[PDB]
Amino acid sequence: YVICEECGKEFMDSYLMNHFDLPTCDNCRDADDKHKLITKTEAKQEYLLKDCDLEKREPPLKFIVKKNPHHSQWGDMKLYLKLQIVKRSLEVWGSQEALEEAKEVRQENREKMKQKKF
Amino acid sequence: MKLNVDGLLVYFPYDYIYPEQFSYMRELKRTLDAKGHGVLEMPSGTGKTVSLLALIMAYQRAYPLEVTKLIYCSRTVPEIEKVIEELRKLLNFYEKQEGEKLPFLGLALSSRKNLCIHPEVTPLRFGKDVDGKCHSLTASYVRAQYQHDTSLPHCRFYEEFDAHGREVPLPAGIYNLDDLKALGRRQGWCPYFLARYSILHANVVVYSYHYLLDPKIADLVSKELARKAVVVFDEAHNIDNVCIDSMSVNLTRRTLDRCQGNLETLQKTVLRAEHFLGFLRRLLEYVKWRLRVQHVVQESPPAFLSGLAQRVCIQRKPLRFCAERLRSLLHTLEITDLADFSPLTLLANFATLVSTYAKGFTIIIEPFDDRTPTIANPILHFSCMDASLAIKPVFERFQSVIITSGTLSPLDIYPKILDFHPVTMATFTMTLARVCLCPMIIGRGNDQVAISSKFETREDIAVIRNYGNLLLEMSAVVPDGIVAFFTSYQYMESTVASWYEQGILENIQRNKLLFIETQDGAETSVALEKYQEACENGRGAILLSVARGKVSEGIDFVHHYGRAVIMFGVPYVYTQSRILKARLEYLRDQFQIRENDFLTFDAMRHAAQCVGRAIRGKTDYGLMVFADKRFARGDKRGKLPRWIQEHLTDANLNLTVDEGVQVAKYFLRQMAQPFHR
DNA sequence: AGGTAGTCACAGCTGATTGCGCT
DNA sequence: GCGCAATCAGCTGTGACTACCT
Numbered sequence A: 001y002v003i004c005e006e007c008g009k010e011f012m013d014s015y016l017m018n019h020f021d022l023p024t025c026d027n028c029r030d031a032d033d034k035h036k037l038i039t040k041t042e043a044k045q046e047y048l049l050k051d052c053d054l055e056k057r058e059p060p061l062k063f064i065v066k067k068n069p070h071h072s073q074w075g076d077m078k079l080y081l082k083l084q085i086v087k088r089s090l091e092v093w094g095s096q097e098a099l100e101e102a103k104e105v106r107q108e109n110r111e112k113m114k115q116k117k118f
Numbered sequence B: 001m002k003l004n005v006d007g008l009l010v011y012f013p014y015d016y017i018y019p020e021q022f023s024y025m026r027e028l029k030r031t032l033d034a035k036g037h038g039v040l041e042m043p044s045g046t047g048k049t050v051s052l053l054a055l056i057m058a059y060q061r062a063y064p065l066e067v068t069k070l071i072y073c074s075r076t077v078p079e080i081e082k083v084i085e086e087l088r089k090l091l092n093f094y095e096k097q098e099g100e101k102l103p104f105l106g107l108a109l110s111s112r113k114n115l116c117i118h119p120e121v122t123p124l125r126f127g128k129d130v131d132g133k134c135h136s137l138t139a140s141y142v143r144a145q146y147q148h149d150t151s152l153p154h155c156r157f158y159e160e161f162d163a164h165g166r167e168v169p170l171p172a173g174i175y176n177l178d179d180l181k182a183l184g185r186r187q188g189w190c191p192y193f194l195a196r197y198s199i200l201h202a203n204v205v206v207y208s209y210h211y212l213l214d215p216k217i218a219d220l221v222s223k224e225l226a227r228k229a230v231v232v233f234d235e236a237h238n239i240d241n242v243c244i245d246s247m248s249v250n251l252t253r254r255t256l257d258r259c260q261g262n263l264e265t266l267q268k269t270v271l272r273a274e275h276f277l278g279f280l281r282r283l284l285e286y287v288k289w290r291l292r293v294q295h296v297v298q299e300s301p302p303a304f305l306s307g308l309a310q311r312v313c314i315q316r317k318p319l320r321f322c323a324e325r326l327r328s329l330l331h332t333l334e335i336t337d338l339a340d341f342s343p344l345t346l347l348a349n350f351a352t353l354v355s356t357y358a359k360g361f362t363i364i365i366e367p368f369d370d371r372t373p374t375i376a377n378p379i380l381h382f383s384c385m386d387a388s389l390a391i392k393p394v395f396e397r398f399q400s401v402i403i404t405s406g407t408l409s410p411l412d413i414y415p416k417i418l419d420f421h422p423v424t425m426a427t428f429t430m431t432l433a434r435v436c437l438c439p440m441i442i443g444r445g446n447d448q449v450a451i452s453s454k455f456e457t458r459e460d461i462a463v464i465r466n467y468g469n470l471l472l473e474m475s476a477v478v479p480d481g482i483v484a485f486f487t488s489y490q491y492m493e494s495t496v497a498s499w500y501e502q503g504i505l506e507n508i509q510r511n512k513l514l515f516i517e518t519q520d521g522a523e524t525s526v527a528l529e530k531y532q533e534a535c536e537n538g539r540g541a542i543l544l545s546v547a548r549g550k551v552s553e554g555i556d557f558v559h560h561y562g563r564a565v566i567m568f569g570v571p572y573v574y575t576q577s578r579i580l581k582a583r584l585e586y587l588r589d590q591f592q593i594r595e596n597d598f599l600t601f602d603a604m605r606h607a608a609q610c611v612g613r614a615i616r617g618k619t620d621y622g623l624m625v626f627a628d629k630r631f632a633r634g635d636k637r638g639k640l641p642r643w644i645q646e647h648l649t650d651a652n653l654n655l656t657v658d659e660g661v662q663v664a665k666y667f668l669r670q671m672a673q674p675f676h677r
Numbered sequence C: 001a002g003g004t005a006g007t008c009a010c011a012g013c014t015g016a017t018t019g020c021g022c023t
Numbered sequence D: 001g002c003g004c005a006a007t008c009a010g011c012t013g014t015g016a017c018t019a020c021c022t
């Protein structure tokens, strides 16, 4: 059996465990806010995570492939668990610390590059 | 000679061994020592079978207890006969190099039509009636009545085999199918029955895929033969596809008409137990209800039995007893012949499957037909969606299942398309004294316009003109036959009609003859024959066909036949019929397979399969061109087999028509020179 | 009364960004 | 929306021209 992290009730299988190896039962599955799923590009832009940090740093981060409502023939969206993405970003960049200044100086350098191009 | 692997010595008929063959043998020995499954990929049609058989024999000699039974399932009968004769050559080499015989038995299995001696059943071309006539001639009741010596026409081979062929075994001597037929006719025994009696006391045995993928016969042909056994599916690059055909059935008006015609005869014979007699009568009306319903599509694999149990109020359990009825009730009825009875059997099998197998399947109804869309044609498909169901029984019964073919470029998709645990991830690229192939991707034409076969540009005049110009000025540099493949029959016929309308097809006509492949089997065969005879002399010819056709895999273009193979656009399967999309959804929500990635994989797999048949043998050489800029993209080049990637230099990935022609001329000129061994 | 670190030209490389394509 | 290829930033090699101390 698997012990849920929230209720502690033993269970055999759960949706999150099958797709993300998360020991959380469907009763405690807060998929609306706590277990929100975001697109691959959104995670890369917000958390400055590269492919290697998403696929090669242990543990590997799984994703769910879902159809795109805008266009079915377009690239199917990949959804990652927000908690896992946050944990990976914290393990790579430390914390909510100077990484913010790092992205600030990144956009400052982008402005520097555009003004130099002008 | 005697190849010395780290813990064994293996005899090989050929003194010279290519490094690829040695690496393949090392990898296969590693897999056998690993006691696990795997997937392999080789670029040569010949030379793989001899190496596989030699290593199997060496492993059996070294470890008789570890391996007891070997299976070499192939696609068709020519492969079976060629591997049988290759095994015969290997055994002859072993005998001539050692001097003493060994108790090894090798037999080939096929349908009853292939292995039969009665002259009253050979001439007919009914594959569904040979089994019925064979069962009628000899069965349990025939054996029971043979005690009184009834004067009736019946098969007598079994009546002699059961008293004379079940005592003398065949410890040694590998026998081909014709050899088995000769032995049966000289001993008055049935080849099929002696094959059934001899598989238990045998070393190796080969047959086709349908004897393992179809559960209705695999259990009968292999139940307790060997717990520790080795099976291989050579040339199975489309195995999953045929796996679908293992659990896919279709229903039409002819089937229900035949059923309603024959049920009256069945009832008349009965009145001359009751748990099924009245059960079968009202089964047809439920499925004919959908005939009168004009609806687009209905999908309810779990709820279909619910609708059945609501309309007619039948429990699900008796359906599971339908199959065991076939061997119980029918033998009491003494059916004269299985003709006009097969639809009933397939309906019973369909009912049993939908009662049992409904987790990963889908029921589809299509009110569409070719050239007669909506007149009368509701087609019901119990289409399969997961290839694991057709592959689980062989994986749970065998230890080292190996999947090998000429095109298995993505080794990461097969283990996730079907439940698999590969431990090999091995690819092999053939090498010779010179580069025998010159693959190249031709992008934009002389007008600097892409020649991509996009759906929005299928009717574009510019791409059609570019394709015509490419086929014209290409036909003057490569001699004696060019094989061109189009995306579909509709696109192919539209393009040739457009070429006929312009004054461009006539220019191609004077260089090479134009031959068109159609759906007719006889027409296709005669077109292939005339193409072969035209390529034999200096006239030269062009064979235009489709990538997804029976001619794509039915023939191999040996050297001097089809020096050039042209791909006009990436061949994409049609998204209609609501069959591909169901599989895409199942792979998305079950195996997390990208729809675009799967479509690209299928397209490139078909393209590589139809383009890699121009290289058969070391001395053979050929040219391979792709007439689409989409092939230049990395996501599609990566799907090509490894033995073609290294020969596809980055210099020619988007070159125009003229430079492609120059490259072809240079390659042919430099490959026309003699070489060495 | 006689010699070398910056500076300039023209190429290379790798490390990211960054608009373009879609059966 | 995702994925592949085009683009630039930064650093370096090669060879030559030029402004202040023994």
Ligand code: SF4
Pocket: B112, B115, B116, B117, B118, B121, B133, B134, B135, B137, B138, B155, B156, B157, B158, B189, B190, B191, B192, B193
């Ligand atoms: S028992 Fe054998 S020989 Fe006789 S009809 Fe059947 S297949 Fe032919």
Ligand SMILES: [Zn+2]
Pocket: A004, A005, A006, A007, A008, A009, A024, A025, A026, A027, A028, A029
């Ligand atoms: Zn819980």
